[PDB]
């Protein structure tokens, strides 16, 4: 089992890098794939790729060796890079939900409203906020707790645990996860409501002749929507729930579980290529690249 854990890290890195490299290539190389939605997918794929290339490897070795081998500065820089890429990834999932909301419910409005320049500004903002939650507080020691046993891990270069004050653990978790999640629930709930209410109008149209039923296309939409919200929440809610818990009653949740739940979150970066790049044009480009 201890050897199974190390093998399982290797495939995680392979899936993340393979999948995301393949997506970014597909979008860059094909003229047809360069849509506005795929512009937000490109932001997402960059973040996830940096997770696979830098964050997960260094994270893997902290589990293998039981200790940080690259010193205090690279513990701080790596912690910042982790938070940056996770913040950018999850916030970008939220921006995508809004993009698809506008394009589905109000498609003619969406074309004039969401320009290429406006999409770039949104993307820049997602990354700027990711930076100011990650690099600004962590490098400047604002994330630091005053506790003595916490202050032992900051003094020790071999120790690279994630220990934060109350403020930072709450604020970072909200900005990286909870604001994005609530926006995604609100946004995608209205796509369900829009489709539900549209079935209502089609039934009123009939003059009591027919009652609409859920066909193929409605059940596929529900499955897709279930995968989007289900996989994202399965992967990141457990870690981010615990991350707020640990501030208040610290010994309540073990350390092995806290780390394992964080790794569950890194797995989402391997799932995101699969969920958000199933379009016919993506499937064709992927065949052309291989």
């Amino acid at each position: 089992a201890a050897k199974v854990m190390s093998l399982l890290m290797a495939l995680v890195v392979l899936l993340i890098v393979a999948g995301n490299v393949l997506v970014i290539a597909a979008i860059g190389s094909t003229q047809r794939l360069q849509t506005l939605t795929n512009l937000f997918i490109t932001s997402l794929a960059c973040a996830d790729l940096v997770v696979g290339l830098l964050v997960v490897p260094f994270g893997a070795t902290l589990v293998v060796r039981g200790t940080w081998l690259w010193g205090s500065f690279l513990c701080e820089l790596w912690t910042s890079l982790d938070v940056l890429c996770v913040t950018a990834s999850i916030e970008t999932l939220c921006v995508i939900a809004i993009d698809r909301y506008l394009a589905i419910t109000s498609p003619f409005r969406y074309q004039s409203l969401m320009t290429r320049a406006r999409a770039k500004v949104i993307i820049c903002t997602v990354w700027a906020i990711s930076a100011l939650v990650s690099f600004l507080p962590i490098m400047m020691h604002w994330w630091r707790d005053e506790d003595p046993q916490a202050l032992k891990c900051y003094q020790d270069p071999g120790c690279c645990d994630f220990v934060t004050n109350r403020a930072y653990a709450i604020a970072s978790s909200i900005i990286s996860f909870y604001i994005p999640l609530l926006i995604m629930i609100f946004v995608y709930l209205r796509v369900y409501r829009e489709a539900k209410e549209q079935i209502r109008k089609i039934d009123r149209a009939s003059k009591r002749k027919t009652s609409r039923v859920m066909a193929m296309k409605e059940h596929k939409a529900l499955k897709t929507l279930g995968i989007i919200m289900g996989v994202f929440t399965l992967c990141w809610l457990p870690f981010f729930l615990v991350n707020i818990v640990n501030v208040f009653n610290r010994d309540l949740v073990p350390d092995w579980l806290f780390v394992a739940f964080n790794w569950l979150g890194y797995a989402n970066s391997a799932m995101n290529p699969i969920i958000y790049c199933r379009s016919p044009d993506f499937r064709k480009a992927f065949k052309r690249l291989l």
Partner: nanobody
Amino acid sequence: VQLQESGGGLVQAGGSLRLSCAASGSIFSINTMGWYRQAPGKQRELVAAIHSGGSTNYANSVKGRFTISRDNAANTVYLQMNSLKPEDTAVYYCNVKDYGAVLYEYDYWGQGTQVTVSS
């Protein structure tokens, strides 16, 4: 999903025509039906489109003259073309954009139906 197109033909300048595309098949509740056209030796351009929530979109060449509407019950879209000119002569295609995938749109195109207007 099959798009059956009718109402096209020959008509005199100043005349009216009513195109009608019925879409038989599985389509998501939320969708955008429209009419495109392709003049001889030109690119396919949008004429008119209507969202499942009543939103419309017209091209300036046909604004004020052409009116697009959709059948309340079934997936059928009508384009009432009035004050026709010889410029409007084209192969008019019916289009359905299905949003059932959520993350992307799927296109359906009809075979095309000839409209020809003379002066």
